[PDB]
Amino acid sequence: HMHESRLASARLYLCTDARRERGDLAQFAEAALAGGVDIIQLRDKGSPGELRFGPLQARDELAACEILADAAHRYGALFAVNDRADIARAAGADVLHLGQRDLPVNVARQILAPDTLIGRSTHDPDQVAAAAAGDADYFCVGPCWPTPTAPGLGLVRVAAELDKPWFAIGGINAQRLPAVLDAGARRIVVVRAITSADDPRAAAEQLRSALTAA
Amino acid sequence: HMHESRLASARLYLCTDARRERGDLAQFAEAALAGGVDIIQLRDKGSPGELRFGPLQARDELAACEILADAAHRYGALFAVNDRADIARAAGADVLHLGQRDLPVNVARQILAPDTLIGRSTHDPDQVAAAAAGDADYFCVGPCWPTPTAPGLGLVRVAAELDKPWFAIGGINAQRLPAVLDAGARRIVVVRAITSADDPRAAAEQLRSALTAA
């Protein structure tokens, strides 16, 4: 109900790992949410923590979800969980984000409370089309910039010219944001731009200032 | 309904990774099930595949579940999925196995079809007690033998002297089985004993012969 409304206006999306190697998850989320983050997603896959201790177990993941879910709600933000529909339901997440290789949307809709929102990752023009017409509540478009693991801004353009909310994602930061807005994107998902900042709050405020400034 | 009955008599339990680096999952499961395996569980965590390609994504996991679920059912065996209640429901698994650090049982019982069975891993006398008295349909006891990641046979003994089915687990093979039976165990979960055998079928038949021979 209210989630669609909050999502509809969200412009700054953040994905963060559990930060198990730093132990400052709670404080880090405070800083970032106080900085303007509208939606925050727990996505530990490929994190330094996963590299040092291995994949996140459910118990620990639930613990991190409660921290993130509580902070998000105290700031009027949305809390999203990646791939696991069982964790999402146990944690009462506002959003379940499903990439192309994660659980099938229709399967997730069977487990999740009816009001939970679903997001999808898209990487080519066909997925973008399928997402815009699909069941999804929102979708991401990218990676805009290459990573050791890339559609580029051309796909952002395809999304801009087709009303479901969609976000631009992939190596986005302050310096590259002008190009992202140029390609027609009005919402963005960021990671390292805030995740590895010396001052998450400031980093976030800076990004949100440029965002609303369009 | 029928699952409790099949579980009640099961003596040979097998845990196998998706075998992504070998691509012989289907044939491997055939051999093992034709060899007497009563229950087969997909548990990819810490596998060579996870080390080379990373954690198993949901889509791929579901693909492996369908292979294993079909083979198990063709042989009258049970098919179990580890930790993910969402994957279990999507795959129609007969069993969801939950270790101590995985999803909470009560959470899983909310997602799973009512007839799905739940198993639990136990590692000390208190967990064994909690499992024997708990909601669980069965539980495992171990690791009996150390691994680079150990309760030993002393815990198997605690389980034997208290009726819920329980399995002995942890570095079990042909040579060590006599000790396991000595400690009072009547059911076992094996991994490498069959998983890395040159002839899974024969390896399995051999283990089941000693098992029933008690």
UniProtKB/Swiss-Prot annotation, chains A, B:
InterPro entries linked to this entry: Aldolase_TIM (IPR013785), ThiamineP_synth_sf (IPR036206), ThiamineP_synth_TenI (IPR022998), TMP_synthase (IPR034291)
Q: Which cofactor does it need?
A: Mg(2+)
What's the record's note on cofactor binding?
Answer: Binds 1 Mg(2+) ion per subunit.
Which residues are listed for 2-[(2R,5Z)-2-carboxy-4-methylthiazol-5(2H)-ylidene]ethyl phosphate binding in this entry? T147, P148, T149, G171
Keyword line = Magnesium, Metal-binding, Thiamine biosynthesis, Transferase
The positions making up the signal sequence are none
Q: Which family does it belong to?
A: Belongs to the thiamine-phosphate synthase family.
Q: State the NCBIfam families in the record.
A: thiE (TIGR00693)
What the protein does? Condenses 4-methyl-5-(beta-hydroxyethyl)thiazole monophosphate (THZ-P) and 2-methyl-4-amino-5-hydroxymethyl pyrimidine pyrophosphate (HMP-PP) to form thiamine monophosphate (TMP).
- The name of this protein is Thiamine-phosphate synthase
